[PDB]
Amino acid sequence: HTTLGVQDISTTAMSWVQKITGGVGLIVAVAALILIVVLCVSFSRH
Amino acid sequence: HTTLGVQDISTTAMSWVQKITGGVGLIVAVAALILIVVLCVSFSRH
Amino acid sequence: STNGTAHGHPHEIILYYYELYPTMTVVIVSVASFVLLSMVGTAVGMCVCARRRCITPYELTPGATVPFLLSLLCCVRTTKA
Amino acid sequence: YEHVTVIPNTVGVPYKTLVNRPGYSPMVLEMELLSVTLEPTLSLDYITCEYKTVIPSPYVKCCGTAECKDKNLPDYSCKVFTGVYPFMWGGAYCFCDAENTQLSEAHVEKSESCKTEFASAYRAHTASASAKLRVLYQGNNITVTAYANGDHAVTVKDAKFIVGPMSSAWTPFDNKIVVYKGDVYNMDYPPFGAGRPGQFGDIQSRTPESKDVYANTQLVLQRPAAGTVHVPYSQAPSGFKYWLKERGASLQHTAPFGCQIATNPVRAVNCAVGNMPISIDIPEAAFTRVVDAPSLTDMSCEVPACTHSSDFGGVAIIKYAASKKGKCAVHSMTNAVTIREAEIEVEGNSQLQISFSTALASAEFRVQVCSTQVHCAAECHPPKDHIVNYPAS
Amino acid sequence: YEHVTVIPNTVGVPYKTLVNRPGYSPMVLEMELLSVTLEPTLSLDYITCEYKTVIPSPYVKCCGTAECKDKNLPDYSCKVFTGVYPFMWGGAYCFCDAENTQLSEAHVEKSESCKTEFASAYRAHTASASAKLRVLYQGNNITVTAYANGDHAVTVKDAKFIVGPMSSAWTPFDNKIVVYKGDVYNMDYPPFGAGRPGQFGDIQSRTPESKDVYANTQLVLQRPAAGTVHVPYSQAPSGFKYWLKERGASLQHTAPFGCQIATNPVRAVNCAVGNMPISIDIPEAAFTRVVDAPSLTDMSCEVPACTHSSDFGGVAIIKYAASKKGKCAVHSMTNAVTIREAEIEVEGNSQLQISFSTALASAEFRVQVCSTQVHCAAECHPPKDHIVNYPAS
């Protein structure tokens, strides 16, 4: 009957592009946390 | 017919009672102003 | 009609636009832009954090250099003269 | 000259309007609502009446078995009873002792009375306006009967009258109504094909002359008595006959605003609620130039008697100095006081007696005689009766 | 067993429903709307037609004066012309040279054609809907015609059908309509007794056989020509005759949703919009226990041909392994794909061919044969036509 809202296909290919986005977000989140950790180390050092 | 929201009569008498209210309000308003005036005199005196 | 092949990669992805559409792709593009902004914001934050690390050792006196390499690209180049 | 005015939807109260055509002497018209008709747009759902349980002669099969045939009839019921030994005038009808059967078939139909004795189930949608009203035009009472839609024009004494459109919109009828002869009931009747046994709607038909009928009466056949030929059955009594006894008072007696309910067609007569506009196109043949009239000077108003009531309980004497003999209009410039006199005759140095109605104890009112105004001072007293038998402004 | 289902208000599209009574084998019913008329009440305001200007023989008074008599007739016009010297076949009709007068009287009446050629001015209030549903019950098509109110029950093949109530209430007609023969116009016609000359409503009458008429035609008598006997006049031409030329297209051609307008009585036929509920009380005699059925195992689905269109453009072959001979229900577990077959016959190690309709190019759908499911892989192709002549799901 068609006439509906996606999304739908095309798997693989679709994953190829999707995988490119969000990874860098995780990286900068981890780096942010690490910077906080080091900051706390300095706070402890003082 | 008839039937409606006042006020209406009965003149005179009506005025007799009305005149009793609001005069004291004017008095305390004037007294308030006079007190402010004196306060300003003190402020000037200092 | 407007065959909506699968891929690929991507390629076909844009072919679907014709199939069910007006819209679809524009929203995805907006999402991509938002993702780019998140990526850019992360980088900006990272650079500020890198400053936060090089801070203290920003006054003077020997002491890196030293940890300035290994050292997140500045670190150095920075220690020197 | 077209005169537009708005009066409240109140029957029995006279309202006076001042018609002032520039360059022509003022005119006073008295209008009174005699009756107000609200006819709702109806859609017949179905009709209910007394039912007829059509039972034929029972098929008594001697020395054998009878079989039930599934028939397409309203509330069709069939049953075969084994081991029957019935008796007649000259003895037993059957030869066998226990090998006999009796087929008892039954169905529900519309009674012969349904054409005469029936209750109609209507669905009221929207209603319209329309009523009559009297008016004293040129010193004579005229009757005007027209629809209150603001389109239906009626010409009486060369004057075009347009009544309505109605301000509201209240009706004593609900979205579902029931009509029996001359009584209308606000009932939430069961829908078509959903009637229950013993209740209003146990038998449902489209029209009193309709072919197909709906029947839910809970009809069950019983085993006949020993040596007896009869068709005993258990069935819930007529819902229509029960309703005719347990319906109570109709809208005619229970409706608010003193509504009078009429039938064929069903509509509400005389109902106070909201206002109503009225347009009057008075011909130029009933107008008189101002110049052709007289003026007035030095005016004094004396009130020798006043009693504040629903009727004209006040008497006022107005002194004047007129330029010439002619007719002058009398009207109160105060919305609390109303004058009985619409127009009087003036000459020169004379006086005039007028009747007035007011509610206030202390009444200071301006009376406009011809084109000049006069101040009236009155100290009206309370009446002997607290409740009156006629409405007022 | 009562089965409640909701189908869209779309005529010509078949919809399939799965009836699953616990403990009993599933049943598939195919419903399809046929039509959906719509009749709304209407209170005749008035009727308009061609007018007749009734002019009698002019009263020529030789050597004297004639006087106009004020007559109570629609658009009555009278005038007396002084100094007339008319001529006939054998000479002058009058003796005097300038002492003659001519009385010219006229009035407007309903033409003889008003019984045949007329336009009716109606006021539409509320509308009553009535239709038509096709049901494939027990391998046979049955016709059900009932009111879509959700109360009117119709029994076909011992199954009670309840249609409605309607989800929505739109009508192509306004609160004011005009009907001429077989054409209905949404017109804001002038009210009764307020018609203008030369326009629609210049002559207003209650019914084509009515006695009293309203007339506003702007009729004025003119002075006759030198030595001529005739009644010259200035009057605005027939508003009805002018409207018959400048009315345009009727509702039949201008109404939305593909509405077809019928007459006597007026009503709208064929109109889509909104959904509709349907309650089916299937008898317990049409149900079969499950314990009286079979199963299946290992089933592969192959699609040798598929074309995504409004109709069943796909062919599917399903292989199976059945326990015993019996009937099994076929239904698509995917809302995008629809199967033409409701039930088929199974035996053991065999196959089955089914017709399916879909819109998607890449279609991965699950088909539930009896109680076991099978995955179907299909790569459907586009059809040759972009526009189709039948609706689909």
CB-based burial of residue C13 (10 Å sphere; 0-12 exposed, 13-18 middle, 19+ buried)? Answer: buried
Number of D to E CB contacts under 8 A, please give it: 51
Q: Is E362 on the interface with C (CB under 8 A)?
A: yes
From chain E, pick out residues whose CB is under 8 angstroms from the CB of A8. 360, 362
CA distance C31 to C34: 5
**Which of E336, E338, E357 faces A4 most closely, judged by CB atoms?**
E336
Token look-up 């345009």 returns E248
Both structure tokens of B7: 């006020």
Contacts of E33 (CB under 8 A, 6+ apart): E7, E9, E10, E11, E12, E13, E131, E132, E133, E134, E276
Report CB contact under 8 Å: D126, E128: no
- Asked if C19 lies within 8 A of E361 by C-beta distance, the reply is yes
CA distance D154 to D148: 11
Looking at residue D112, the DSSP 8-state letter turns out to be G
Q: Which residue has the tokens 């052709």?
A: D292
Q: How many Cβ atoms sit within 10 Å of the Cβ of residue E72?
A: 6
Q: Give me the count of residues in chain D.
A: 393
Q: What does the alpha-carbon distance between residue E392 and residue E44 come to, in Å, rounded to a whole number?
A: 42
**E389, amino acid identity:** N
Contact C42 A6 (CB under 8 A): no
Query: Token pair of D198, please?
Result: 């013993």
CB contact under 8 A, C4 and E362: yes
User: Chains with ≥3 Cβ pairs under 8 A against C?
Assistant: A, E
A-C interface: how many C-beta pairs under 8 angstroms?
70
Asked if E362's CB is within 8 angstroms of A2's CB, the reply is: no
Tell which residue, E7, E10, E5, has the closest CA to residue E34.
Answer: E10
User: Which are the contacts of E374, defined by CB distance < 8 A and separation ≥ 6?
Assistant: E299, E300, E301, E318, E366, E367
Neighboring chain B residues of D362 at a CB cutoff of 8 Å: 8-12, 14
C29 inside 8 A of chain A by CB = no
Q: How far apart are the CA of A29 and the nearest CA of chain C, in angstroms?
A: 7
Whether E309 has its CB under 8 Å from any CB of chain A: the answer is no
Please give the structure tokens belonging to residue E110.
């309903």
Query: Number of helices and strands (H, E) in chain E?
Result: 2, 34
With beta carbons less than 8 A apart as the criterion, state whether D200 and D183 touch: no
DSSP label of D116: T
- Treating both helix axes as pointing N-terminal to C-terminal, what angle do A23-45 and C25-54 enclose, rounded to 10 degrees? 20
CA distances from E217 to C21, D160, E195 (A): 61, 17, 9
Using a CB-CB cut-off of 8 Å, the residues of chain C touching E362 are 4, 6
Q: Do C52 and A32 touch (CB under 8 A)?
A: no
Residues of chain D found within 8 Å of residue B1, distances taken between Cβ atoms: 13, 15, 310, 338, 357, 391-393
Partner A contacted by E13 (CB < 8 A): no
Q: What H or E segment, with its residue span, contains residue C54? A: helix C25-54
| CA angle (D350 as vertex; D349, D353 as ends), nearest 5 | 160
Please tell me the distance from the alpha carbon of residue D60 to that of residue D87, in angstroms, as a whole number: 11
Least Cα separation, residue C44 to chain A (angstroms): 9
Give whole-number Cα distances, D53 to D49, D106, D216, E132, in Å.
Answer: 13, 7, 12, 32
**Residue D106 is encoded by which pair of tokens?**
């039954």
Cα angle: D33, vertex D37, D38; to 5 degrees: 130
CA angle, residues D316, D321, D327, in degrees to nearest 5: 75
Neighbouring C-beta atoms of residue D260, cutoff 10 Å = 15
Residue D225, classified by CB atoms within 10 Å of its CB into exposed (0-12), middle (13-18) or buried (19+), is exposed
Vertex D213: Cα angle to D210 and D214 (nearest 5): 150
Query: What does the block give as tokens for E50?
Result: 């061609």
D270: region left, alpha or beta (phi > 0 left; psi from -120 to 50 alpha)? left
Q: CB of D250 within 8 A of CB of D261?
A: yes
How many CB atoms within 10 Å of residue E313? 17
In angstroms, the CA A2 to CA E303 distance is 18
Alpha-carbon gap: D43 to the closest alpha carbon of chain E (Å): 8
Q: How many CB atoms lie within 10 A of CB D275?
A: 12
Chain D nearest C-alpha distance from E192 (Å): 5
- Going by the DSSP 8-state scheme, the letter that residue E311 receives in this structure is S
* Residue D327: CA count within 13 A, CB half-sphere: 14
What is the count of residue pairs from B and D with beta carbons less than 8 Å apart?
A: 30
* Residue numbers of C between 15 and 54 with CB closer than 8 Å to E: 19
Contact D191 E41 (CB under 8 A): no
Q: How far is CA D154 from CA D8, D36, E48, in A?
A: 21, 16, 18
Chains that touch A (3 or more CB pairs under 8 A): C, E
Helices (H) and strands (E) in chain B, counts: 2, 0
- The pair of three-digit structure tokens given for residue E126, joined into one six-digit string: 């509320």
Nearest to E318 by CA among E298, E339, E332, E300: E300
CA distance E151 to E277: 12
Instruction: Label residue B30 left, alpha or beta by phi (over 0 means left) and psi (-120 to 50 means alpha).
Output: alpha
Match 């998607």 to its residue by tokens: E360
CB contact at 8 A, E41 and D40: no
Distance CA D107, CA D105 (A): 7
Which amino acid, one-letter code, is at D253? H
For residue C7, give both structure tokens.
Answer: 């891929």
Residue E177: count of CB within 10 angstroms of its CB = 21
Q: Give CA–CA dist E297/A36, Å, rounded.
A: 60
Residue D154: alpha-carbon gap to chain centroid: 23
Question: What whole-number distance in Å separates Cα of residue D371 and Cα of residue C16?
Answer: 87
Bridge partners, residue E29, by sequence: E17
The answer to whether E255 touches E170, Cβ cutoff 8 Å, is no
Report which of D299, D301, D315 is spatially closest to residue D358, judged by C-alpha positions. Answer: D315
DSSP letter at E285 equals G
* Minimal C-alpha gap between B37 and chain D (Å): 46
Q: Distance of CA D159 to CAs D3, D149, E82, E220, Å? A: 11, 18, 32, 21
Separation CA D131–CA D145 (nearest Å): 6
Q: Which residues of A touch C9 (CB under 8 A)?
A: 12-13, 16-17
D312-325 in b/e burial notation, b at 16+ Cβ within 10 A? bbbbbebebebeee
Give per-residue burial for C27-38: e unless 16+ CB within 10 Å, then b.
eeeeeeeeeeeb
Please give the Cα distance from E364 to E375 (Å, whole number).
Answer: 7
User: Smallest Cβ distance to D393: which of B2, B8, B11?
Assistant: B2
Cβ–Cβ < 8 Å for E267, E40: yes
Cis peptide before E332 (omega within 30 of 0): no
In chain D, residues 36-95 whose CB comes closer than 8 Å to chain B: none
**What number of other Cβ atoms are within 10 A of residue D293's Cβ?**
20
What are residue E289's phi and psi, to 5 degrees? -55, 155
Most D-contacting residue of E45, E71, E122, E126 (CB-CB within 10 A), to test interface: E126
